[PDB]
Symmetry: C3
Subunit: 142 residues, 3 copies
């Protein structure tokens, strides 16, 4: 049994290692981030991620934020994050409805507020509330 489990863990390490080495994904602790390289709107990203068995990425620690930023930098595009203020403005929540804890707003944001329901990450890793219809790099977490 333990030899079976050793084998299994080893093979998982190998597959993860190859995907990491080749830049196919980025792991931060127990979270994996990845992109298909496409730039599409918020609803399309959500669909793309859930179809792959994941979720549109959202950073909950500085180290997670920096990993997503590095992907934004690599593709030179902003990234939509997994949070919205669709109910009442300024009140951002994760897509499961929980209130946001970690934030990294660009100085002065969130503002501009007509309806800026979504959040985009600039390539320096800071955040801007934005409408949800822009074409942004699809980044998923697993």
């Amino acid at each position: 049994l333990q030899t079976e489990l050793y084998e299994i863990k080893h093979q998982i390490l190998q597959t993860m290692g190859v995907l990491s080495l080749q830049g196919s994904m980025l792991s931060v602790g127990d979270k994996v981030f990845s992109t298909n390289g496409q730039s599409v709107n918020f609803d399309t990203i959500k669909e793309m991620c859930t179809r792959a068995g994941g979720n549109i990425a959202v950073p909950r620690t500085p180290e997670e934020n920096e990993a997503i930023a590095s992907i934004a930098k690599k593709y030179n595009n902003y990234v939509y994050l997994g949070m919205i203020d669709d109910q009442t403005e300024g009140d951002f929540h994760y897509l499961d409805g929980a209130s946001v804890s970690y934030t990294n707003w660009y100085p002065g944001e969130p503002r501009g507020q007509g309806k800026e329901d979504c959040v985009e990450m600039y390539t320096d890793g800071t955040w801007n509330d934005r409408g949800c219809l822009q074409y942004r790099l699809a980044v998923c977490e697993f």
Copy 2:
């Protein structure tokens, strides 16, 4: 133990998710389809797939058929499938020798019959019996 198994299942989900997201493979239920993008004959495809620990793909449900068709469409080439009528014509079997159940013949096929031992999938997902020496997209199942 259960935490160990939770960890293992999570990591498998992550690696599968990254491969899916990036278009490296397509999963239909418990079956995974993938291509190396090469176009080669039937015997070479078989070798290529078994070397990777899989088998030349064969659809057994409409949903499996559509996944392989989508790969054929993406690469704009026909796909050899894992079935033959090498013994007596019109009598198609899977490579393990079992009689074929699900079929999706293009209207009028199978015909043309000299020796058309193999089966190719057109890019609309329908099938044609064909000789085995053509260059066709290598699609494997795992």
Copy 3:
């Protein structure tokens, strides 16, 4: 439980199979080799591999040697291997400090010895002791 373990092993086979089929990695027995395609010096390769959860590759059997050689051939570059003679010349050890067993020196090597601390693999799979500051294909094992 056994169905759970069957599922897990199957999915691992699928992910390994896709990575193999697509040329992302090469498996020899229980060892996986892979490259990010970059050419950098010895210290950088070590870092690159350990960051991915692996180690700079070193062949310990003829079959492992041939797999790394095939990657060197594919990228038309020499490969730094995971061994050094930094202590006293001619005395090569793996990075964990164990004495080297399997070798495949090009005829006449190791020689040229000023300080040739590292080992590079030529594209025919044979070895040359070399300084560690050259740009060589990064090949990792997992």
